[PDB]
Amino acid sequence: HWGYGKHNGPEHWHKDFPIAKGERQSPVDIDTHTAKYDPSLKPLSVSYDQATSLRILNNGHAFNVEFDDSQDKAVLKGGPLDGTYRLIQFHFHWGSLDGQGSEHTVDKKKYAAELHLVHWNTKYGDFGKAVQQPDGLAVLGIFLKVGSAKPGLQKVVDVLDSIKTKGKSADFTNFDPRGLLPESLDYWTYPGSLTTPPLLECVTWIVLKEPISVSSEQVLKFRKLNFNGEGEPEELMVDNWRPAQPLKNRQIKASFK
């Protein structure tokens, strides 16, 4: 029953998920002046050429574009990571207004939305196992600002009318997630958590410095989705973001000077 409403939103989650008040919760504010360049950080290796998208699902909290992760087909390596992380899904968090929607903030700036490409550490065998480990997941976070359209996002936007409500899914094959990346792979990185229940502290966060731009029409279509199931009172899927959590005993590292 957790959600993003007045009565079940982020400030309530701790009652069912006590880890909500844990030592490495996400998202966080990225204070760019305090983040330290780490010369020992490697370039990110994003290898998405062999990606196999399968399906798009409205899960009542966001929509997931899901990939075949039964083989090393689309993987993230390098950067802060040891080993190989397989792409399982991507999704977004977004606002009711262009001035909010991102989970991470940059010097307190909120972006219109945030893309999360979720990967799991292959040494743990599958995703369910991986989320139980402190280095189980790597989530690549990419900010969205409103300006010019992102041509690579349009295929996602156009299928949304077919998954308007919670529990709806649609075939979604041959989608290339490379079309969602910015030019630069400069990043910040820190140890954190899932940003929704179960809020497990299993994520190495890698957040790209360069946002992608999407059009107002593209984000407007995100905002036409529903949190509710079909035949239930319409509640627009908007503001499905958790606010910044205390940094506590963590340092944010930068890949760039």
Ligand SMILES: Nc1ccc(-c2ccc(S(N)(=O)=O)cc2)cc1
């Ligand atoms: N069972 C289960 C396992 C993991 C998640 C989950 C996965 C990724 C994220 S996020 N928003 O990418 O940090 C948040 C939650 C949700 C449900």
Ligand SMILES: [Zn+2]
């Ligand atoms: Zn997310």
